Amino acid sequence: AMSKIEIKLSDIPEGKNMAFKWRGKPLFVRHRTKKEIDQEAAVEVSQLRDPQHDLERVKKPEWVILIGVCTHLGCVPIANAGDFGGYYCPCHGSHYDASGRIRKGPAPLNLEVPSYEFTSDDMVIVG
Ligand code: FES
């Protein structure tokens, strides 16, 4: 079983972005704090290059799950870097927020949100 990955949530503490390998690429499972959740909720969406509310990019507010591949040219976004406390792609300087939305730099789109579901309070199944 490699098409779907099952991740134990209790292993990822608040504030941590945990990376896994899925379908040959990085997969990020990040436990967000109340502060991060509220900050993403405060974003004025009409000004975004790729407009989406934070709540249509996550199922549970305290968890953001993203494909760790920069939408510009494919490099790997670095967690807790950049001007928006989200991610930073060093290849050409794209800055993403904690929702994975593109906020500064050349990338054209928000980081991809894969298909996933929570099977219980402790597990999330991606794919
Ligand atoms: S590949 Fe990420 S900014 Fe260019």
Side-chain angles (χ1 to χ4, degrees), residues 70-75 89-94 96 106-107:
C70 182
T71 67
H72 180 234
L73 288 175
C75 284
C89 184
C91 291
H92 310 91
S94 293
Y96 302 87

Side-chain angles (χ1 to χ4, degrees), residues 32-43:
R32 304 193 300 190
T33 62
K34 175 191 158 54
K35 186 183 176 177
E36 286 170 328
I37 293 163
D38 296 347
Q39 180 162 300
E40 296 311 330
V43 176

Side-chain angles (χ1 to χ4, degrees), residues 24-90:
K25 299 298 173 186
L27 170 70
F28 297 163
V29 182
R30 177 175 176 166
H31 198 162
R32 304 193 300 190
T33 62
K34 175 191 158 54
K35 186 183 176 177
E36 286 170 328
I37 293 163
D38 296 347
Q39 180 162 300
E40 296 311 330
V43 176
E44 209 288 285
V45 173
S46 79
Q47 299 290 351
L48 294 172
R49 168 177 285 146
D50 183 13
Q52 285 182 294
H53 190 278
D54 180 64
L55 300 186
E56 70 187 291
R57 290 177 58 77
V58 300
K59 287 194 167 184
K60 286 182 175 166
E62 68 269 21
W63 295 102
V64 67
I65 302 182
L66 307 164
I67 297 302
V69 177
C70 182
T71 67
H72 180 234
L73 288 175
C75 284
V76 178
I78 296 162
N80 308 289
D83 296 345
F84 303 83
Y87 304 81
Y88 173 73
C89 184

